[PDB]
Amino acid sequence: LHYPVTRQGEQVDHYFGQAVADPYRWLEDDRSPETEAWVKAQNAVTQDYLAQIPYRAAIKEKLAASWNYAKEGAPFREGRYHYFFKNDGLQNQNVLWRQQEGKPAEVFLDPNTLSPDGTTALDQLSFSRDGRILAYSLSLAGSDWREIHLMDVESKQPLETPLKDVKFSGISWLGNEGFFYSSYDKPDTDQHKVYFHRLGTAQEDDRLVFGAIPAQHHRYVGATVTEDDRFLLISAANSTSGNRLYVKDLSQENAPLLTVQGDLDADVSLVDNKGSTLYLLTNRDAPNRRLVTVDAANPGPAHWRDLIPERQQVLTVHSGSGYLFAEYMVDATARVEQFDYEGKRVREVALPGLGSVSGFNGKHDDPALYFGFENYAQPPTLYRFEPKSGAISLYRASAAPFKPEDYVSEQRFYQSKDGTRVPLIISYRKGLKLDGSNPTILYGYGGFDVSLTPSFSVSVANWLDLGGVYAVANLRGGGEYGQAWHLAGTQQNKQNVFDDFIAAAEYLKAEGYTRTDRLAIRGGSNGGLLVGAVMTQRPDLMRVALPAVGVLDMLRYHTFTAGTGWAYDYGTSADSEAMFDYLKGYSPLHNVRPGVSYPSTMVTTADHDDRVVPAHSFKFAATLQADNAGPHPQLIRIETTPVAKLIEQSADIYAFTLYEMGYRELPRQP
Numbered sequence: 001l002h003y004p005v006t007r008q009g010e011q012v013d014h015y016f017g018q019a020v021a022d023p024y025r026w027l028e029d030d031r032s033p034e035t036e037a038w039v040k041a042q043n044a045v046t047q048d049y050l051a052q053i054p055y056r057a058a059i060k061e062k063l064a065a066s067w068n069y070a071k072e073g074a075p076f077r078e079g080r081y082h083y084f085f086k087n088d089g090l091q092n093q094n095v096l097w098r099q100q101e102g103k104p105a106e107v108f109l110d111p112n113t114l115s116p117d118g119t120t121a122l123d124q125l126s127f128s129r130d131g132r133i134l135a136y137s138l139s140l141a142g143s144d145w146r147e148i149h150l151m152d153v154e155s156k157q158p159l160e161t162p163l164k165d166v167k168f169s170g171i172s173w174l175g176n177e178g179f180f181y182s183s184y185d186k187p188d189t190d191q192h193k194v195y196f197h198r199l200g201t202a203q204e205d206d207r208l209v210f211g212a213i214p215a216q217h218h219r220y221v222g223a224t225v226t227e228d229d230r231f232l233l234i235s236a237a238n239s240t241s242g243n244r245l246y247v248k249d250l251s252q253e254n255a256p257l258l259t260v261q262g263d264l265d266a267d268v269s270l271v272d273n274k275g276s277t278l279y280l281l282t283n284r285d286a287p288n289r290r291l292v293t294v295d296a297a298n299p300g301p302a303h304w305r306d307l308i309p310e311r312q313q314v315l316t317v318h319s320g321s322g323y324l325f326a327e328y329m330v331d332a333t334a335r336v337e338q339f340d341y342e343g344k345r346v347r348e349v350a351l352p353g354l355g356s357v358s359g360f361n362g363k364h365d366d367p368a369l370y371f372g373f374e375n376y377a378q379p380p381t382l383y384r385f386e387p388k389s390g391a392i393s394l395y396r397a398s399a400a401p402f403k404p405e406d407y408v409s410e411q412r413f414y415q416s417k418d419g420t421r422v423p424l425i426i427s428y429r430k431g432l433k434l435d436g437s438n439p440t441i442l443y444g445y446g447g448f449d450v451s452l453t454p455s456f457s458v459s460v461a462n463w464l465d466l467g468g469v470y471a472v473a474n475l476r477g478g479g480e481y482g483q484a485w486h487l488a489g490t491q492q493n494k495q496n497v498f499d500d501f502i503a504a505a506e507y508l509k510a511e512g513y514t515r516t517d518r519l520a521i522r523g524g525s526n527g528g529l530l531v532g533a534v535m536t537q538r539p540d541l542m543r544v545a546l547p548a549v550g551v552l553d554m555l556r557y558h559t560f561t562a563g564t565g566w567a568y569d570y571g572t573s574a575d576s577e578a579m580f581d582y583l584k585g586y587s588p589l590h591n592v593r594p595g596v597s598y599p600s601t602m603v604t605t606a607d608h609d610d611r612v613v614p615a616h617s618f619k620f621a622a623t624l625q626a627d628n629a630g631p632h633p634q635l636i637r638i639e640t641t642p643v644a645k646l647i648e649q650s651a652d653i654y655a656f657t658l659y660e661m662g663y664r665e666l667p668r669q670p
Contacts, residue, residue, distance in 0.1 A: 001049050001633055004041035006622040007034075013555070016577040020555060020590070024622045028556075028615040030608050035618065039607055039638045042621070046602075046635045050652055053659040058670040060651035063462050067647055070399040074359060074370030074382055075099075079131020079153065083108065089399070092118040096125075108156065114138065124148075126171035126179065129229065133159060133199065135171045135179055144168065148181060150199070163203050168192065172225045174250065180209060180223035180232065192221040194234055210234050210246070210257070218244070225250070226273045227364055231296055233260070233270040233278075242266055247278065247296050260299040272319045274341045279307065279324070281317050286310035287483045291317055291326065307343045314482055320362025320369045321387040325349070327357065331411065331423045332453055332474045333375075336360065338390070347390050352383070354411060354425075356453045360385070370395060375454035376427040376470060377407035379461075402461045406430055409454070414507035416476075417499040420488075423474040424504050425454060426513065429464050434512030438469045439661055441520045442505055442542075445527040446475035446497035447569050449486040459650040466654065467667030469513050473504040475530075477569070491571040492582050498533045505534075505541050520544035520657045525612050526551060526569070532588030532620060535599055544657050545601040547588075549609065552616035554587035555580075560613045589616070592623045597630025600660035602653065606639045614638070632660070 008023035027035050050056055073085035073094070081098040084105075093111035114120040119141035126135045132153050137146040148163040148171060169182035178198040187195060187204045193211030197203060209232075211221050218236040225232050230251050237243035242264035246257040261268045266284035273279065276296050283289045284301060291308040294300075308315065313328040313335075323346065324339045333354040338346040351357060352373050359371030369387060374380040379398030385391070409427040416422055432438060441463065445452055452472055460470050474480045477489020477497040489497040505521065508514050519542045523530040528550020535545040551570075557563040558572040571579045584590055592598075601624060605617035621636035628634050637652060639645065658666065 001045060003625045003634075004038060004045060006038065006625065008626075015555065015573050015580045015584075018580075018584075020584070022556075022619075024619040027618040027622060028613070030614045030618070036607075038618070039640075042636045043638055043640075046637050049633060049635060050655060053655045054664075055658075055666050055670070056651060056655035058666065059462075059466070059655050060647065062465070062670050063459065063647050063650055063654075066401045066462060067458050067643065069401060071380075072382070072396050074372070074395070077131075077363070077366070078127040078134075081108075081131070081153075093121055096122075109134075109136070109151075111138070115141070124169070124171045126173060127153070128173050128176045128179075128199075130176050132176070135173070137166060137169065137171065148197075160199070161203070163197060163206075168220055170222050170224065172223055174225050174232070175229050180225065182221050182223065186212075190219055191217045192219055192236075194221050194223045210236070224270055226270070228273065231273050231278070235269065237264065239264075243268065245269070245280075247299055249276075249296055258296065258299055260294070261301055271317050271324065272341075279319075279341070280304065281315070288313060289315040291315070291324070308339060312482075314479070318360035320360055321366045322364055323387055325360040327360070329451060329453065329480065331413075332425070332451060332480050333411070334453070336371075338387075349385065349390065350392065352381070352392075353378070354409070354454070356455055374456040375409055376425065376456065376460060376472070377409040377464075378404045379456045400456070400458065400461070402458075402465075407461075407464060408432070412507070412511070414503055416496070416503040418496070420476065420496075420500065422476070422500050422504065423480065424471055424507065425474075426469060426471045426508075427460070427464060428469045429467070432469065432513075436509065436512050436515040437518060438514050439467060439518050439520075439658060439663070439667055440469040440471060440508060440514035441522050441546075441657070442471045442473065442501070442508060443522045443527070444473045444475050444501050444504070444530055445478060445523060445525075446489055446500065446530055447477035447486075447526040448566075449479035449483075450526075451479045462650070463654060465668065466658070469508075471504065471508055471513070473501060475500040475504075477526075490569045492579065494570065494582075495586060497530065498537065498586065501530055501534055502538055502541065516541065517543045518661055520546060520661075522546040522548070524548035524550070526566075528552065528612070528617075529554070529588065533586050533591075535601065536588050536591040536593075537586070539596055539598045542599050544660050545599045546604070546653060546657070547601070547617075547620070548604045549606070549612045550588070550603070550616055550620070551612055552587075552620040553589040554583040555590065557616070560615070562611050562613070589620050589623060592620070592627050594627040595629050596627065598624060598628045598632060598634060600632040600656070601634050602656050603634075603636040604639070604649070604653075605636070 011022045011025035013020045068089040070089045071087040075082040075084040081100045083098045085094040087094045091112050096109040097105050098108040099105040111122045112118045123139045124137040134151045137148050146166040150159040152159045165185040173179040187206045194209040195206040197206045219238045222235040232248040234246045235243045245260035249255040268282040271279040290310040292304040293307045294304045316327045318325040326337045328335045334357045336349040355375030362369045369385045379400035382396040384395040412424045475497050521542050528547040531547035532552045555573045573580045603617050603621045605614045624634035
């Protein structure tokens with residue numbers, strides 16, 4: 001192949017007295033005529049290279065034929081109807097259907113009909129206590145602004161004019177009287193307020209509940225009324241970290257607000273109440289969270305009592321049918337325990353395997369609960385759970401064109417350089433031979449307290465069908481083992497994340513799953529940095545590298561507005577000489593060196609992106625093309641139907657990967 005010429009400039013930056021050259025500084029401007037022309041030239045070379053792969057079209061057709069299929073959500077009762085979401089596989093928005101006792105299901109609310117291009121999406125859905133009126137908000141695609149519409153459920157017609165100027169709001173009813181919502185604007189800046197809208201009145205008359213006086217000023221406020229209509233819980237926060245919480249007893253007239261938590265030093269949220277007892281989920285004095293109870297009449301932190309004490313695993317709580325479900329992440333997969341409201345453990349719920357769950361949410365009187373389950377080998381499946389007996393039955397199998405029994409997903413654990421034990425989930429078609437020849441993709445992220453929990457993806461399923469192995473490592477920096485796991489992958493410990501990933505690659509080879517020339521590494525954003533770091537430190541470790549939307553220039557990433565929010569995880573080159581030396585020591589852009597033979601690489605990024613600027617990918621690819629000395633191609637694919645786009649991208653990635661591994665024909669018949 002022949003790369004486009006990339007002009008080199010003379011920009012030199014200085015950090016604590018050390019000079020650093022940046023010859024591709026001009027590529028930081030993704031909107032200049034010069035950069036846009038370079039983008040066009042790079043895509044031309046990339047497409048021309050991919051066009052020589054004989055089976056690229058076969059891969060694309062295979063993905064295209066398995067990409068769209070019908071979906072259905074769990075049913076929920078409101079009034080005399082059971083409601084459930086469905087998607088025929090083609091419509092952009094899920095449709096809400098309903099069905100009553102002895103009649104066929106019917107469409108109730110189809111969001112696709114509200115927008116010409118079907119971008120208007122339903123956000124919040126909240127029925128009145130009796131199920132007769134529906135309050136729902138719509139997001140006109142991308143905008144944070146909202147309107148709360150009120151619909152008469154029986155006639156499906158509007159009850160009254162929609163509420164306007166709603167933002168970052170929930171919708172919570174007080175019986176059938178009206179509901180609480182949040183807005184920055186007085187109904188008649190940055191001070192979010194809770195209002196109560198009474199049905200049958202004009203919005204301009206909505207009563208202010210919280211947020212207007214100086215002592216209540218907060219950037220984000222929320223309000224929830226308990227299912228039994230006894231308590232109103234108002235949350236107030238200025239950031240995603242910590243919130244104050246107040247409670248009002250609605251069983252009394254003009255009750256004052258009592259303070260459940262008066263500082264922002266911890267997160268605390270309502271689970272439910274039973275009588276005058278509040279059940280709260282919190283991380284106060286409990287990083288992995290705990291479930292506490294306290295009387296609503298004297299609810300402060302000093303009075304909270306543990307119902308479900310903090311454990312070594314992170315806790316999430318669901319409630320339904322008169323039970324509490326404590327969900328724990330154990331080695332990146334879900335476990336669920338059922339408790340009564342008195343704190344007695346009823347049983348451990350027997351899940352279908354190791355994966356990710358959703359559900360176990362219901363009303364106090366729901367006769368059954370539903371939960372979803374999926375993992376890398378199993379498409380999302382719905383199950384029915386009988387609360388008292390604990391019996392579980394399949395409710396809805398997935399319509400995805402993949403048979404679960406055809407795939408295997410196993411959890412292994414390996415050791416990193418420093419001895420740390422790290423989880424690794426490996427998936428593939430049943431009947432894989434550990435002869436080290438399997439085409440393998442190793443995926444990781446490693447940062448920002450992000451936990452990589454199993455999730456099903458058509459793209460991955462197709463890779464497995466092509467004979468591939470897909471491995472995901474739960475590297476440090478993530479939140480799989482809580483705060484300490486995250487911290488061990490930040491700032492001057494970031495190298496730990498890369499060491500964890502290198503050790504996973506070494507493990508996949510040693511255990512016989514693959515070998516160097518049959519291994520690809522992949523990751524996106526912070527995961528793109530991961531791929532960039534590992535391929536510049538160990539270019540001999542893998543045959544293919546796939547860094548997507550990566551943060552690759554670690555010395556200047558913070559000078560872009562979105563990067564100013566990742567300081568906790570990365571630190572910046574303006575922090576201190578030590579932090580500067582550390583970043584320069586691993587910064588992918590600054591560690592590509594002339595003379596080195598890099599693996600075949602396909603850098604991916606959108607042409608314009610304000611979250612992770614294309615500058616990182618552009619400069620990184622330019623440097624790889626200038627410095628690489630071996631026979632492997634260093635390509636960049638710049639993305640400029642969105643489903644067609646996604647199918648096209650997966651086809652290019654898989655065709656490139658197998659082709660670079662030397663496959664003349666696909667490993668398995670298409």
